[PDB]
Amino acid sequence: DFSAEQSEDRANSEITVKGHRVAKDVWGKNAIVQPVQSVADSWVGANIPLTIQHYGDATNESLQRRAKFEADRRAAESKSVNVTVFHVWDIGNIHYVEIPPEGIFDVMECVSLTYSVDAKSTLETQLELAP
Amino acid sequence: MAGPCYNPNEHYLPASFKGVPFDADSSDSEHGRNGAEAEFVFGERTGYADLGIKIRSYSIRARFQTNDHVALSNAFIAVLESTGPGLLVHPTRGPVMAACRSARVTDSKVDAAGVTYIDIDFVEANDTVTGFG
C-alpha cells in the first residue's frame, strides 16, 4: 500500500530571520538592525512570506543555518509518503522508489520505521519516506 | 431407555413456576466454563487459563389441550410477566431459581384450533446483596 501527498499549507517561498547580537562588545546599529538575513526555497512558485525570530546570539552564518533547518523541515513535510512492505535496515537510509501512476522516480530518505506482528501471522512494516 | 418397564411419570418431575403448575413438553439446558485460550507467534505450543463458571440457561415448551385453553394460557402469561425471579421446578434438573427472559405464544384458528403452544427461555438468577459484597 502507499499514500503520497503534497500540501501547500506547509510551504513558504521566502523565510526571514531577525535577532540581536550578544558578543563581548557589540551594540548600536551593528547589534540591533544589522543582523538580518533572508533565504528562499524557489521550489514553490507562489508568494507566501514568513518571518521568524532568533533565540540566541545572532550571527550572519547562524541566521542562514536556522533558515535552512526550517526549509528542510517544511520541504519534507510537504511530500510525506507511506508504504507497507509485508515481510520484515535502518532509518535515514537511501532508497529508490517507483510509482509510475503518480510518477515517483526520485531518491528518498526514510524518516521512520515500524515493525508490527500479530498472533494471526500478520507481519508488516511501514515507512515514512521523504526527499 | 432400556427394557420395557419404564414409567415416565415416575422419572420426570412435574413442572411449575412460582407455584402455578403447567404441563411441560421439552427440557433443555446449557452449561460450560469460561476459558482464555491463547496462542503465541512462531510457537509450537499453546496455553489455557480458567476464568470461572458460565451462567446456565433453560428452555421449556408447554402445551395446553384441555377445554378452554385460552383462559389457562392467557392466565399463565400474567405470571411470567410478574416482577422478579421465582422458584422453577425443572422437569429433570430439579428445583432451581430462574427469571423468564422471553416467551413466544403460537396459535391459529384454522390450521390448529384447540391447542396452544408457548416456548420459554429461562435464566439462572441467584440473589445478591445491594452493597456489591
Give the C-alpha separation, A44 to A7, whole Å: 11
B122 CB-contact burial (10 Å; exposed 0-12 / middle 13-18 / buried 19+): buried
A17 with A63: CB under 8 angstroms?
yes
Q: After which residues is chain A broken (C to N over 2.5 A)?
A: 88
Give the C-alpha separation, A129 to A11, whole Å: 18
Contacts of A118 in chain B (CB under 8 A): 41
Contacts of A121 in chain B (CB under 8 A): 41
Distances (CA, A) of A108 to A9, A50, A74, A104, B10: 22, 27, 16, 10, 85
Residue of B nearest to A122 (CA): B41
- Compute how many other C-beta atoms are within 10 angstroms of the C-beta atom of residue B1: 7
Determination approach: cryo-EM
> What single letter denotes the amino acid at residue A40?
A
B77 with B105: CB under 8 angstroms?
yes
User: Which has the closest alpha carbon to A94: A73, A108, A111, A80?
Assistant: A108
A52 with A89: CB under 8 angstroms?
no
Residue of A nearest to B41 (CA): A119
User: Which has the closest alpha carbon to A13: A41, A53, A51?
Assistant: A41
B103 with B73: CB under 8 angstroms?
no
Helix, strand and coil content of chain B, in percent to the nearest 5, comes to: 10, 45, 45
Distances (CA, A) of A10 to A6, A17, A41, B37: 9, 18, 13, 49
Contacts of B39 in chain A (CB under 8 A): 119
Length of chain B in terms of residues written: 133
* Interface contact A121-B40, CB threshold 8 A: no
Contacts of B37 in chain A (CB under 8 A): none
> Which resolution, in Å, applies to this structure?
3.4
User: Which has the closest alpha carbon to B94: B53, B56, B55?
Assistant: B56
The reply to whether B41 touches chain A by the CB within 8 Å rule is yes
- E strand spans, A13-49: 14-18, 36-40
Residue of A nearest to B40 (CA): A119
- Compute how many other C-beta atoms are within 10 angstroms of the C-beta atom of residue B98: 23
> What single letter denotes the amino acid at residue B32?
G
* Interface contact A121-B41, CB threshold 8 A: yes
* Interface contact A117-B39, CB threshold 8 A: no
A5 CB-contact burial (10 Å; exposed 0-12 / middle 13-18 / buried 19+): exposed
The reply to whether B44 touches chain A by the CB within 8 Å rule is no
Residue of B nearest to A123 (CA): B41
Lookup: cell for A42: 524557489
Residue with grid cell 557589540, as numbered in its chain: A26
